């Protein structure tokens, strides 16, 4: 079983160091796998279901 | 005064007959479940033994 | 509950329909017109710039000249309101030539149903609606629906329907008694525009054969335009037409008819 991505509203933690530099390039050419874009009208916590 | 009272006694009462429509709908949908799992007598009796 | 629904209905007022003030010669518009009659407009010249011309489907029966064979019932009504049609036909001197070259359907602009018309001796005030649901102008607000006679309306009918059924207006030029004379019918279907043009051709199967054979000794290029379909507005589906007889005359009346307009499109 390959571990996948999921959009479930985790209680995320904040790190002191930043992440945001060179991310916009890295979506076009894959620096890292398991990514999914979200635009601002739909970038939120999804409704939890089970 | 007799017109503002002649409107809110219709809007609340229409919700009373909307709230009535669910308790009538509870008894309908339980009996809709009980009949879709209801085999008749002539089938079940020989299977039941 | 009561309190949550106490606010969720306050925040929705619906838009008001438009109103086009019309101003008619009183001999071209009868006093006994049913409130909810569909209208038209005819604006040929521009030199007067004072008074306006309106045409009902009843009054257009006098100008058209289609006989009582294809339309018996309004023929009793169009005559009892207009004796010789002289109050109507004297304004338009080209009632035999506009039917020749086919320019009458380009001049009509459909408007919609009536709202409020104060009858007067010389100049009759007429208020109609163009957009929106037909409502009254003044304080006694009565929902005026559009009314069509059973003589002019021709219906088109598992039929899966959307949120829409429309009313059309065909206007077909022909020649009876070897003189030109148009013909007007009304349609009602929500079948989309790609079907009704294929259905109106089957409504005029025995008419196209009885013109071009009648006009084969001489045929003119300006005769080749044959009809024009407009789009008058939408009826909400599941709303039914109501039969109604008026002094008699059987008239269908629709409810909740919101009105629109459309360009005249040629079909043949």
């Amino acid at each position: 079983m390959e571990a996948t991505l999921e959009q479930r509203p985790f209680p995320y933690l904040a790190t002191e160091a930043n992440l945001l530099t060179q991310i916009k390039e890295s979506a076009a050419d894959g620096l890292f796998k398991s990514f999914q874009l979200l635009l601002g009208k739909d970038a939120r916590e999804g409704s939890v279901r089970f | 005064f007799t017109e503002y009272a002649g409107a809110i006694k219709t809007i609340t009462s229409a919700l009373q007959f909307g709230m009535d429509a669910l308790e009538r709908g509870l008894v309908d949908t339980v009996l809709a479940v009980k009949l879709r799992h209801a085999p008749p007598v002539f089938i079940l009796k020989t299977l039941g033994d | 509950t009561v309190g949550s629904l106490h606010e969720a209905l306050r925040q929705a007022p619906f838009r008001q329909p438009t109103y086009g003030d019309f101003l008619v010669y009183s001999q071209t518009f009868s006093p006994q017109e049913p409130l909810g009659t569909f209208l038209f407009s005819f604006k040929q010249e521009d030199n007067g710039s004072s008074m306006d011309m309106l045409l009902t489907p009843t009054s257009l029966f006098m100008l058209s000249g289609m006989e009582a064979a294809k339309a018996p019932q309004t023929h009793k009504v169009a005559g009892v309101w207009y004796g010789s049609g002289s109050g109507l036909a004297d304004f338009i001197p080209n009632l035999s030539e506009l039917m020749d070259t086919g320019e009458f359907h380009t001049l009509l602009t459909p408007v919609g149903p009536m709202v409020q018309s104060v009858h007067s001796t010389f100049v009759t005030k007429v208020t109609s609606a163009m957009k929106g649901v037909g409502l009254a102008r003044d304080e006694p607000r009565a929902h005026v629906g559009l009314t069509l006679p059973c003589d002019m309306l021709v219906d088109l009918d598992r039929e899966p329907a959307g949120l829409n059924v429309t009313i059309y207006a065909s206007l077909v030029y022909l020649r009876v008694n070897q003189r030109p004379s148009m013909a007007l019918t009304f349609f009602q279907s929500g079948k989309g525009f790609a079907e009704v043009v294929a259905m109106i051709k089957d409504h005029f199967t025995d008419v196209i054969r009885t013109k071009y054979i009648q006009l084969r000794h001489e045929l003119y290029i300006n005769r080749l335009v044959f009809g024009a379909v407009c789009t008058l507005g939408t009826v909400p589906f599941d709303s039914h037409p109501v039969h109604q007889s008026l002094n008699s005359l059987p008239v269908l009346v629709f409810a909740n008819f919101e009105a629109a307009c459309g360009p005249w499109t040629v079909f043949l």
């Binding site: 279901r49 089970f50 | 009535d20 308790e23 339980v30 | -």
Partner: protein, 44 residues
């Protein structure tokens, strides 16, 4: 003015409810499925 008022009904005060176990669930629109896994042992 003379009006009628219809007789109101309760589900739990009808004798139908001997054939149902009744647990009120607050947010059922948040549910996808539910399941009961029986495990029947068998003697020989």
């Amino acid at each position: 003015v003379y009006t009628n008022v219809v007789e109101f009904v309760k589900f739990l005060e009808t004798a139908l409810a001997a054939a149902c176990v009744n647990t009120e669930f607050k947010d059922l629109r948040r549910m996808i499925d539910g399941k009961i896994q029986f495990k029947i042992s068998m003697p020989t």
